[PDB]
Amino acid sequence: MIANENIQDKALENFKANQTEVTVFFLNGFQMKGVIEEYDKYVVSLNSQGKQHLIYKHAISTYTVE
Amino acid sequence: NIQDKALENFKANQTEVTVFFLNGFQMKGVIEEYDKYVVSLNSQGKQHLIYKHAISTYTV
Amino acid sequence: NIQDKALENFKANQTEVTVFFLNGFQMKGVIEEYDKYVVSLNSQGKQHLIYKHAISTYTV
Amino acid sequence: NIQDKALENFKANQTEVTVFFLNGFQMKGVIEEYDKYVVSLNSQGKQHLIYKHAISTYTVE
Amino acid sequence: NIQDKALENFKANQTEVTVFFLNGFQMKGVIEEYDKYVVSLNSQGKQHLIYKHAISTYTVE
Amino acid sequence: NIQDKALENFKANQTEVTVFFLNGFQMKGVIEEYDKYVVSLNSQGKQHLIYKHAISTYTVE
Secondary structure, three states, rough: OOOOOOOOHHHHHHHOOOOOEEEEEEEEOOEEEEEEEOOOOOOOEEEEOOOEEEEHHHEEEEEEEE | OHHHHHHHHHHHOOOOEEEOOOOOOOEEEEEEEEOOOOOOOOEOOOOEEEEEEHHHEOOO | OHHHHHHHHHHHOOOOEEEEEEEEEEEEEEEEEOOOOOEEEEEEEEEEEEEEHHHHEEOO | HHHHHHHHHHHHOOEEEEEEOOOOOOEEEEEOOOOOEEEEEOOOOOOEEEHHEEEEEEOOO | HHHHHHHHEEEEEEEEEEEEEEEEEEEEEEEEEEEEEEEEEEEEOOEEEEEEEHHHEEEOO | HHHHHHHHHHHHOOOOOEEEEEEOOOEEEEEEEEEOEEEEEEEOOEEEEEEEHEEEEEEEH
C-alpha cells in the first residue's frame, strides 16, 4: 500500500491505472511520451508509438501529463 | 533540516520559485506538494513531478 | 524484476536494442550478457561493457 | 572535516564564494547557511537553495 | 561479477581499451590498476586516475 | 587503496595535477588536502574545494 506522504507512487500508480499519456523528461533535457505500463524502484516501462522503452529512474528529471 | 523546512515553507506560502535542473534548464512555478524524493511544481498551467536528484537549485 | 526480465528477453532473442546514455548518445546493438552493474553490448563488430549508471533507456 | 571547516569559514566571514555546478555554470555570492545536503547562497539580491549533489567546486580568491 | 572479471583480464593482459566518459569523451590506453571505485589508465604520455562513477563504457576489439 | 595512495603521492610531492570534471572541463593545479569527499586544489593563485563526486579523472604527466 501507498502512504499519504508518498506522492511519487500515488502519481505513478494513477498514471499506470489510467493509461495516461505521460511525457518523461531526462537529465539531458530530451523527452519521450508514452504510457507507463509498469514501474518499480529502479525502472519505468514506457509504451510509446512503435517503441517500448525501459527507463532508469536515475535518468529521469520530470514527468508531465497532457 | 534546511531543505525540509524550506520546502514546507514554499508549499505553505505558495512561494514562486524557479527550479534549475542539473542540465541548466529552468522552470518557474509553485510547489504544490513534495516528499523526500520528488517535488510537484505547477508551472504554466501544468503539473510537473520532478525528481530531486535532477534539481540543482531553488531560486526564490 | 522488471529490468532482469527485459534484459533476459533481449539477450535470449538477440534483440536489436538501442541504448541511450545519460548524455543522450545512442548505440544500437545486441546484449550478450549483463549483471547488477553492467551490460555487455556488441555493436558494429566491437564489444562494449557499459555501466548501468550511465544508461538512460533501453529501446526496442 | 575539510568541507565543514571551509563552509564554516565562508559563512562566518561572509566570503565571496563562487559555486561551480556540475554543468559548469557558476554563481558568485555569500553562503548564509548549509547542512549535510544543501547550501543557501545569497547572490544578486536573491536566495538560492543549492543541492550539494549539484555542486562541483567552491572557489574563493 | 562481469566488471571485475573483465578488469582483471584487462590488467593482467595489458589490453588496449578505450574508456568513454559520461560526457562522451574517450581515452585509449592500458589499465594498470583498479579497485572498487577507480581505474588507473596509462594513455599517451599521461597517467589517468579515473573514477568509475564517471565512466560510461569500456570498449575493446 | 589506489585512490588514497595516489592522492597521498600527489600531495606529498606537490605534483602538478590536472583535474577533469564530469562535464569535461579541466583545472591544472596542486593538491593541498583531501578527504573522503573533497579535494582542495590550488590553481593560478586561487583555492578550489572540489567534490569528488564531480571529478572524472586526475591526470598527471
